[PDB]
Design a protein around this ligand. Structure first.
Ligand SMILES: COc1ccc(Cn2cnc3sc4c(c3c2=O)CC[C@@H](NCc2c(C)noc2C)C4)c2ccccc12
Ligand SMILES: [Zn+2]
Ligand SMILES: [Zn+2]
Lengths: 298, 300
C-alpha cells in the first residue's frame, strides 16, 4: 500500500521526480553545513575564551549563565564574524526553488541570517533555532526590540548590549540552552508536513532538535534527499539504531525505498542537482550577480 | 530622417522597445536616480557647513585635484559625514538590472560615484562610471599608482586617517574624477563603440549640464529615440552656444520638427514603474525590488 515515488534512489531519480507534476511542494531542512563555505564554523564539529573561566564550554549558550555572564558569548560572536556575509550557492539554490514555485518552506537551524541575505523572505522561512536578525531586552516588563544593525554595532564595539530604556541585557532572538523553540516552528510544522512532496535535507547531521525528530514526520511516501558530508538520520534520536523503524532515514537496507544520500559539500550537490534539472546556468548567473552586489561593498 | 516611434510618448517608446528594432539600450543616469536612496545631489544645500573651520577658498575646492593634493583633509571630512550607512539602490537602479536580465542593456553610463549600480547587481562590463567611483582608490603618484579596495579606503576614512600609500607613502585618492582630472579611459573606449550601435537612449535623473553627458547626448545616431525621465526637460541647449533650435543633435521635445525625443516629467522611480507597466514588467520589477531590499535590510 506504500507508494514508490522515486524511480531510483539516486540524484538522477530525485531530479526526475522534481520535474514530475506530483512534486509541487518542497521543504528544505538546512544546518551548519550550508554555511561553512561562507566562512561560518561547522558547529557540528573556545580556545580564545580561556580567560572567561566557564564551568563547562556550553555555559556561554545557557540562558541562565548568559544572563549573569554575557561577555563570553558576545566576545565569541565578535570573533566568529566572517570577513563578509555572502550566502552560498546552496542558499541561492533555495531562492531558485522559490522562483520556480516549488519552495513550500525553508526550515533552518542556523542563526547566521544568510537565508534572508540570499533573498528568502520571512514567509518562506522558519528559523527553528531563532536568529540574530532581531534582539530583545531580557526584562519581561520591557521587551524592547532592537534590529541587527543596532546589535552589530554593540558587538563590534565590544559594548555589552544594554537596553536604552532600562539598561537591562539585550539578547538576540536565538534559542539558548534552556529556552523554548519558536512558536512559529510548531505552527508551520503541523501544516507544512501534511502536504510536503519532497524533503531536501542539506548540511545537517540531524542530531540536534528539532530536526532530529522532525525528519521522520514526513509522509511515508515523501522522498528525502540528504546532501551532507556524512549519512545522518538513520538512528532514532532516543533509541539509536533500530533498522529505521518509525520513519528513520533508510538509504542502504533491503527495505530502502525513498531516501537518497549524496555525500559531499552542499554547494557541489546543489550544482549537480541544478545541472540535472537544467538550472545550472541560471543558478550560477544568480550567484554571480548577487555575490557582485555584496562584493561591491568591499 | 527616419522616425522609429509611432508617437512621442512613453507608450510609443514602450512599443518601440518591444520591437525587434530595439536591441541595444544605453542608460545615461545622474544624481536624480540616487536622491531617493539618500545620496545628496551636489548640483541642488548646507552640505559644506561643517567644513567652515577649514577656511576653503570656495566650497568646491575640495574636489579640485591640485587643492586636494595639498589639503586632502576637507574632502575626507565631508566623505565621512556623507557616508549613508546602508546602500539601498532605487527602483530605477533595479529597472536597469531588469533591462540587463532581459538582454536589452548595452551599457549603463553613470555620472554618480555612489556605487549603487554595482549594488543593484550590474557588473563592470555593464557599467561606464563616467565620473569615476568610490569603489576603488589609487595612490596619486604617477610612478606607483598602487590600487586600493573600498574596504581599505573605508577603514582609513572612518579612522580619520588621511589615506597614504603603503608602498611610497603618497596620498591615496578614491577614483572619483576631480576637477582638473581627465575622464576615465573606459568612458572614451566604450563611448565610440556604443554610440554607433545604440537603438534607444534612456536618460534618467540628469540635468545634462555637466560633462560628459552635456555633450554626449547629441552624439547618438539621428534615428535613435531618446527618452528623458527627469524632473524637468533637459538637453535642449548647446553646452556652450545656448539655445539653437536643437541644431547639433540637441533634445527636441516640442518643436514642429520633433520626431524622436520624449520627456516624461517626474521622479525617476515613478517613471521606471510606469515604463515597466507598459512593458509588462511591473510585477517582476516590484518583486525584484522587494526581494533585494529585504536582502539589504538583512545585511544590516
Ligand atoms: C561607496 O563608498 C562611498 C560612497 C559615498 C560616500 C560619501 N558620499 C556620499 N554621497 C556622495 S555624492 C558625491 C560625493 C559623495 C560622497 O562622498 C562626493 C563627490 C561629489 N561630487 C563632487 C564634485 C562636484 C560638485 N563637482 O565636481 C565634483 C567632482 C558627489 C562614502 C564615504 C565614505 C566611504 C565610502 C563612501
Ligand atoms: Zn529594556
Ligand atoms: Zn604609492
Amino acid at each position: 500500500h506504500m507508494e514508490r515515488l522515486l524511480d531510483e534512489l539516486t540524484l538522477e531519480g530525485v531530479a526526475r521526480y522534481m520535474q514530475s507534476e506530483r512534486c509541487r511542494r518542497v521543504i528544505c531542512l538546512v544546518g551548519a553545513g550550508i554555511s561553512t563555505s561562507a566562512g561560518i564554523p561547522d558547529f557540528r564539529s573556545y580556545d580564545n575564551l580561556e580567560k572567561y573561566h566557564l564551568p563547562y564550554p556550553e555555559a556561554i549558550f545557557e540562558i541562565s549563565y548568559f544572563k549573569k555572564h554575557p561577555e563570553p558569548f558576545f566576545a565569541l560572536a565578535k570573533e566568529l564574524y566572517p570577513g563578509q556575509f555572502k550566502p552560498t550557492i546552496c542558499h541561492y539554490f533555495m531562492r531558485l526553488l522559490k522562483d520556480k514555485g516549488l519552495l513550500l518552506r525553508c526550515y533552518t537551524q542556523n542563526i547566521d541570517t544568510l537565508e534572508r541575505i540570499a533573498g528568502l523572505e520571512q514567509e518562506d522561512l522558519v528559523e527553528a533555532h531563532g536568529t540574530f536578525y532581531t534582539s530583545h531586552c531580557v526584562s519581561a516588563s520591557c521587551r524592547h526590540e532592537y534590529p541587527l544593525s543596532w546589535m552589530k554595532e554593540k558587538i563590534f564595539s565590544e559594548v555589552t548590549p544594554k537596553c536604552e530604556d532600562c539598561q537591562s541585557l539585550v539578547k538576540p532572538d536565538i534559542v539558548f540552552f534552556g529556552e523554548s523553540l519558536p512558536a512559529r516552528f510548531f505552527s508551520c510544522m503541523q501544516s507544512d508536513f501534511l502536504k510536503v512532496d519532497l524533503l531536501l535535507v542539506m548540511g545537517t547531521s540531524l542530531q540536534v532538535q528539532p530536526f532530529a525528530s522532525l525528519i521522520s514526520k514526513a509522509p511515508l511516501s515523501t522522498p528525502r534527499l540528504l546532501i551532507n558530508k556524512e549519512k545522518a538520520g538513520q538512528s532514532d534520536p532516543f533509541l539509536g539504531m533500530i533498522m529505521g523503524l518509525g520513519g528513520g532515514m533508510d538509504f542502504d537496507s533491503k527495505k530502502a525505498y525513498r531516501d537518497v544520500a549524496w555525500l559531499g559539500e552542499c554547494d557541489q550537490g546543489c550544482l549537480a542537482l541544478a545541472e540535472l534539472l537544467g538550472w545550472k546556468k541560471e543558478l550560477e548567473d544568480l550567484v554571480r550577480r548577487e555575490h557582485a552586489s555584496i562584493d561591491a561593498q568591499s
